[PDB]
Amino acid sequence: MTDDKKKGKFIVFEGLDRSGKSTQSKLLVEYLKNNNVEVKHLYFPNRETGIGQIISKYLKMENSMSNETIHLLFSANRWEHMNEIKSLLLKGIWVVCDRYAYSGVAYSSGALNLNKTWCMNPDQGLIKPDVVFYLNVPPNYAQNRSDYGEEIYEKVETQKKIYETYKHFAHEDYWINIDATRKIEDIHNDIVKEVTKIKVEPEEFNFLWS
Amino acid sequence: MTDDKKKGKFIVFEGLDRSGKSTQSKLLVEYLKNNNVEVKHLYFPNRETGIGQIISKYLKMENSMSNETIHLLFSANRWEHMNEIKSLLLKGIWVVCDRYAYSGVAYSSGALNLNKTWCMNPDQGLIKPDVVFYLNVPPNYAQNRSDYGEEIYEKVETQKKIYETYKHFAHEDYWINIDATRKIEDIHNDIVKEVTKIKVEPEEFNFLWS
Numbered sequence: 001m002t003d004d005k006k007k008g009k010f011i012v013f014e015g016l017d018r019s020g021k022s023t024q025s026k027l028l029v030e031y032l033k034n035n036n037v038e039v040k041h042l043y044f045p046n047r048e049t050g051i052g053q054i055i056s057k058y059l060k061m062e063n064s065m066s067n068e069t070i071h072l073l074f075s076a077n078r079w080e081h082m083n084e085i086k087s088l089l090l091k092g093i094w095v096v097c098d099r100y101a102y103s104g105v106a107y108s109s110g111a112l113n114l115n116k117t118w119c120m121n122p123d124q125g126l127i128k129p130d131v132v133f134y135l136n137v138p139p140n141y142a143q144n145r146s147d148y149g150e151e152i153y154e155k156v157e158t159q160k161k162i163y164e165t166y167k168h169f170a171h172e173d174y175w176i177n178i179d180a181t182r183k184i185e186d187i188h189n190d191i192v193k194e195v196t197k198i199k200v201e202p203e204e205f206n207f208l209w210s
Numbered sequence: 211m212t213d214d215k216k217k218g219k220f221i222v223f224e225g226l227d228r229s230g231k232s233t234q235s236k237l238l239v240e241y242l243k244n245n246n247v248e249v250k251h252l253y254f255p256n257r258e259t260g261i262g263q264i265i266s267k268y269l270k271m272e273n274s275m276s277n278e279t280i281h282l283l284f285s286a287n288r289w290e291h292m293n294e295i296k297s298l299l300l301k302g303i304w305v306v307c308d309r310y311a312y313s314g315v316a317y318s319s320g321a322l323n324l325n326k327t328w329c330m331n332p333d334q335g336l337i338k339p340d341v342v343f344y345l346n347v348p349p350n351y352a353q354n355r356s357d358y359g360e361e362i363y364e365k366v367e368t369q370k371k372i373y374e375t376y377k378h379f380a381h382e383d384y385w386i387n388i389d390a391t392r393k394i395e396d397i398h399n400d401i402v403k404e405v406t407k408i409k410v411e412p413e414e415f416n417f418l419w420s
């Protein structure tokens with residue numbers, strides 16, 4: 001009756017810029033809703049919060065910030081959401097989340113040359129997701145995307161480095177590589193095949209990075 | 211000509227709430243200007259910035275935030291200043307600083323119950339000061355001073371836990387314990403005495419947490 005168990009499932013999309021994360025998670029969520037499964041759609045960065053408004057401005061080059069300043073904002077933005085998320089998952093509501101601490105590490109080490117550990121430390125103790133679908137597109141695949149170049153990191157050479165740093169996570173048992181250069185529909189079914197593989201049962205919360 | 215040495219000295223004050231840090235540093239700056247040193251007065255948190263504004267609001271109880279959200283903001287706030295303080299110290303301007311990283315560790319783990327290491331990590335890599343002046347007073351000492359209680363940690367029980375965690379720095383190279391229970395001018399005196407002790411010569415930059 002004093003229950004502290006995670007009851008929803010936590011699903012994260014990771015990927016390079018414009019890689020289809022909104023496209024996929026919308027659909028996943030939509031699929032989850034036609035199957036008696038409850039789910040909230042989240043995303044990082046959340047540009048609505050105080051902290052979030054500053055991240056946005058950085059991304060849009062309306063301001064500039066130092067590497068370590070912006071990195072810690074991205075991380076704080078995830079912690080300002082931990083209760084929300086924890087609450088949802090306690091209640092049995094699934095969370096499908098577009099970007100997370102991986103983005104944080106991939107981007108900052110890749111694009112801003114920060115040290116990976118340094119980059120990881122702030123995000124330690126955030127809730128561990130049950131799965132990450134890394135939508136995988138090659139950096140030069142991305143550029144053909146509709147709004148490519150409008151935001152700070154969307155330059156081929158930069159994505160090129162971010163693509164390489166993302167492999168820092170390939171060895172995780174929840175890291176699921178998805179070849180994302182396809183028909184939206186194909187990618188979608190893979191995700192589905194993979195989400196029903198998971199068994200629905202209550203369990204203790206886990207935290208990064210362990 | 212391609213020179214990256216530190217030519218200014220960098221002095222932090224640490225202490226519990228309302229200990230006399232602003233007071234003691236207005237004095238040290240005054241003194242430094244007389245005896246011909248160029249010096250800039252800084253303070254943390256710097257409430258005036260996009261981030262500081264959020265910290266301010268937090269401290270006044272105009273918002274709440276998770277512990278981790280706020281702690282990374284305190285850190286971010288110092289990183290957004292490093293470019294400035296590095297330029298100053300590069301040129302030979304001294305920096306006198308009201309509060310720094312130590313505040314972040316002592317407060318966060320003491321008042322908020324965060325893991326020490328985790329608290330330090332985000333500050334790892336900031337410029338190291340030369341000397342820290344800790345204005346030691348007993349935890350219940352300061353409670354009569356003009357505005358005490360207006361801001362979040364200004365509770366006797368909370369001060370005690372902070373006092374215990376500041377000890378984690380107590381007997382270190384750069385750490386200088388000052389009995390700040392005294393009349394202002396006697397405190398000032400003991401500071402100047404240790405300040406005259408400094409060697410003025412250029413040197414390598416040092417970083418937290420070495």
Ligand SMILES: Cc1cn([C@H]2C[C@H](O)[C@@H](COP(=O)(O)OP(=O)(O)OP(=O)(O)OP(=O)(O)OP(=O)(O)OC[C@H]3O[C@@H](n4cnc5c(N)ncnc54)[C@H](O)[C@@H]3O)O2)c(=O)[nH]c1=O
Nearest residue numbers: 017018019020021022023044045074103104107153182184
């Ligand atoms: C969390 C975090 C983020 N960042 C950095 C990383 C990012 O560079 C940046 C902006 O954050 P963002 O999430 O807005 O950046 P993007 O993800 O690039 O922006 P999008 O959200 O728009 O990208 P999506 O991956 O959602 O792409 P999507 O909107 O789904 O689709 C793009 C286009 O492609 C089509 N499309 C979708 N799937 C397709 C497919 N399979 N085949 C062909 N076309 C496909 C879509 O319909 C759309 O037109 O922030 C950090 O540095 N640190 C951090 O901690």
Ligand SMILES: Cc1cn([C@H]2C[C@H](O)[C@@H](COP(=O)(O)OP(=O)(O)OP(=O)(O)OP(=O)(O)OP(=O)(O)OC[C@H]3O[C@@H](n4cnc5c(N)ncnc54)[C@H](O)[C@@H]3O)O2)c(=O)[nH]c1=O
Nearest residue numbers: 227228229230231232233254255284309313314317355394
């Ligand atoms: C940087 C950082 C801060 N914090 C926390 C620590 C803090 O709780 C709060 C910031 O808050 P603050 O630093 O603005 O507020 P205080 O620490 O209380 O410092 P103040 O700016 O309020 O004042 P001081 O401590 O400098 O005290 P001062 O302004 O010198 O004077 C206090 C009063 O006492 C008198 N006084 C001063 N010295 C006296 C003496 N020796 N004897 C008798 N009286 C003395 C003065 O006239 C004044 O009224 O945030 C974190 O949690 N993490 C972080 O990383």
Ligand code: NA
Nearest residue numbers: 021022043098
């Ligand atoms: Na997205």
Ligand code: NA
Nearest residue numbers: 227228361364
């Ligand atoms: Na105070």
Ligand code: NA
Nearest residue numbers: 231232253308
């Ligand atoms: Na002060």
